[PDB]
RNA sequence: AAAA
């Protein structure tokens, strides 16, 4: 009787009922009612026989629209001495026929400007809305005004929040802070940074140090719970969030106000900064032996980026710093080896494959698409961080305290048995492990045993789909990918508000119990599920809202490449037809079912393949094909493939 | 899937 809608292909969807069981129901275009992609809406089952798989639904009333604001493109024209104004909403999956309200509209708003619009009031029954403009965004030819129509789109709030800003600029260094009995000073340690050339938000250092029996490591995270306090209005506009957000160009929208995230909370060099560190020792065969976590003071060294860290290790060029950073640094690089073979032992999945980044000019426009490349320096900081949160997710179960972790399960025995049949016909080795209880280590086992065949990219891609997204919850589930019985997200408090909140219970609970009170915890301890949902919730947005980003930029590129002759493989088929993955810009293409050439072709859905009724010719994911870019559909942000 |  209630549920979400999600809108798909020609904007028919199905229902996902708020009901125990998330019973899924099918809804035509026809039986929408008004309803928009998210709305949550009140439905009944359709008296029809079941046509197979699922019921089918008509919507009989919008419980709770899931946007105020959408973003279209204004257009104005004048017809026998008269006005008239039309949108087109940027979302494919705004169906409805809008009539714009013309005191809604500024006299001096030119055709093609971006818009952001409201539902005033609708006609369910004839698809009708009356909308107003409610913001004006900019030209609507301009990519960066696209950008920030998409995140509109997404509720991904983007503008300065002036209240916020002016909370955060009132922040200062407390001098005296260092001095607390609870906090180590570690001043005189040679901490570093080591991150991207362009990123400013330094929230984690490392000091790595050689004893008899093996290393100390110090992972130092900036100490954002130190300055924001639970409920402030800063705290309440992180919880917002999320999360930082990263788009192309290297535009940030950031979870917290420049204050702290690139002065009070950035370990920028030779200044005291307040941290949390994470301390952990070694043997030499770099399995942990003991850990210690607690407030502390330091001052970095250095900032590095990957770059610099890399070359220097190639021997293609020196690093300016004192020699204790360089043997630090040496350790690092040896405790990391460690720890990546010790995590390999016991039981890990390394998912990396072909990735991207879109390069764009100064004023947004994509200019290329580069392949990034495994980086020694970048694969250091992991281990070391990586290691830092499993240390810090154990701490807080042996302790007791309830946590949000970050959880990942084993994959069905179903999902499995799909993808193994799949996989077969690229001649990816059949597995030996038990469907029911494989390890993360059995997984790892056999990636390795395939690494040179051909179609090892599509094969990474295809588990990362059985495996399905890692999420966060409360409940003690595993992460199967990392390997661990229990894992958190610790080091980036300064864009992850569930490390900010990993760092408030380690104040409430370990660091000054007594300057918390009972209720406070206990607040904290109930608030922890919601907490996980808004994150879950907006994590799914934000990889949305990238998408949106990523298809926008990408068809623009490709939009001057139309004749274009692209080679790649098969990423997926559908009932429509064919994804090829293009190899020169990692880029999914749409070649449609119907204008296949040589044979009428039918999706069979078991094996997801489509064969030719005359010829059995088959398509299947992973195989390899040209295909000559013929148009952009930029309704849908979409490239379109023909076969050649 | 992980890492800033
Ligand atoms: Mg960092």
């Known amino acids: 009787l209630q549920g979400i809608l999600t809108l798909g292909n020609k904007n028919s969807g199905f229902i996902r009922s708020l009901d125990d069981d998330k019973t899924v129901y099918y809804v035509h275009y026809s039986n929408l009612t008004g309803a928009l992609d998210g709305d949550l809406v009140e439905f009944c089952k359709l008296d029809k026989p079941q046509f197979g798989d699922k019921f089918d639904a008509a919507v009989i009333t919008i419980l709770k629209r899931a946007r105020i604001l959408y973003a279209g493109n204004f257009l104005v024209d004048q017809n026998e001495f008269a006005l008239e104004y039309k949108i087109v909403a940027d979302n ?4 409805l026929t809008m009539i714009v309200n013309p005191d809604s509209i500024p006299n001096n708003l030119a055709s093609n400007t ?40 997404n509720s991904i709030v983007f503008e300065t929040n002036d209240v916020v800003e002016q909370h955060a600029n009132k922040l200062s260094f407390d001098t005296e802070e260092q001095h607390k009995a609870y906090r180590q ?13 362009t990123s400013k938000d330094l929230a984690d250092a490392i000091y790595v140090k050689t004893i008899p029996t093996g290393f100390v490591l110090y992972v130092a995270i900036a100490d954002v719970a130190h300055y924001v306090n639970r409920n402030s209005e800063i705290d309440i506009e992180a919880k917002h969030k999320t999360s930082s957000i990263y788009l192309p160009g290297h535009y940030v929208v950031p979870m917290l106000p420049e204050q702290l ?16 560190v994470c301390e952990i020792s070694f043997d030499n065969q770099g399995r942990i032996k003991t850990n210690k976590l607690y407030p502390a003071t330091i001052i970095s060294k250095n900032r590095f980026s990957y770059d610099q860290v890399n070359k220097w290790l190639n021997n293609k060029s020196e690093l300016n710093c004192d020699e204790t950073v360089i043997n630090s640094l040496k350790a690092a690089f040896t405790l990391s080896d460690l720890i990546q073979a010790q995590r390999q032992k016991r039981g890990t999945i390394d998912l990396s494959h072909k990735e991207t980044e879109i390069v764009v000019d100064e004023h947004y426009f994509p200019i290329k698409i ?21 240390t810090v997710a154990w701490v807080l179960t042996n302790n007791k305290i309830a946590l949000p972790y970050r959880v990942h399960p084993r994959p069905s025995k179903k999902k499995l048995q799909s993808l193994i ?19 993360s280590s059995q997984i790892a086992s056999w990636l390795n045993e395939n690494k040179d065949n051909p179609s090892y990219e599509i094969f990474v891609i295809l588990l990362l789909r059985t495996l399905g997204k890692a999420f966060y919850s409360v409940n003690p589930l595993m992460h199967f990918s990392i390997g661990s019985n229990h894992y958190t997200h610790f080091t980036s408090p300064i864009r992850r508000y569930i490390d900010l909140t990993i760092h408030r219970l380690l104040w409430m609970h370990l660091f000054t119990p007594d300057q918390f009170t009972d209720n406070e915890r206990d607040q904290l301890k109930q608030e922890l599920e919601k907490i996980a949902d808004t994150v879950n919730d907006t994590e799914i947005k934000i990889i949305n809202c990238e998408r949106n980003a990523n298809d926008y930029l990408t068809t623009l590129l490709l939009s001057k490449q139309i004749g274009k002759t692209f080679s790649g493989f098969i990423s997926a088929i559908t009932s429509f037809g064919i994804f090829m993955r293009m190899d020169e810009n990692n880029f999914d293409g749409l070649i449609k079912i119907t204008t296949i050439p040589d044979d009428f072709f039918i999706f069979e859905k078991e094996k997801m393949v489509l064969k030719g009724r005359k010829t059995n010719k088959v398509y299947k994911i992973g195989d390899r094909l040209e295909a000559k870019l013929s148009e952009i559909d930029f309704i849908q942000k979409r490239a379109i493939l023909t076969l050649i």
């Open 421 to 439: 049949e799949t996989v077969g016909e690229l001649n990816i080795t059949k597995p030996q492990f038990n469907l029911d209880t494989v390890t």
């Open 185 to 197: 000073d570690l001043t005189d340690l040679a901490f570093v940074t080591v991150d991207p050339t």
């Open 114 to 153: 971006k818009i952001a619009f409201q539902i005033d009031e609708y006609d369910p029954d004839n698809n009708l809305c009356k909308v107003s403009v409610q913001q004006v965004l900019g030209n609507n030819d301009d990519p960066l005004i696209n950008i920030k129509a998409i995140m509109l789109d």
């Open 370 to 390: 580069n392949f990034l490349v495994h980086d020694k320096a970048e694969t250091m900081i992991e281990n070391l961080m990586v290691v830092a949160n499993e």
């Open 261 to 276: 995230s690139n002065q009070l909370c950035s370990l920028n060099p030779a200044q005291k900064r307040y941290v949390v």
């Open 92 to 95: 494919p999956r705004f169906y």
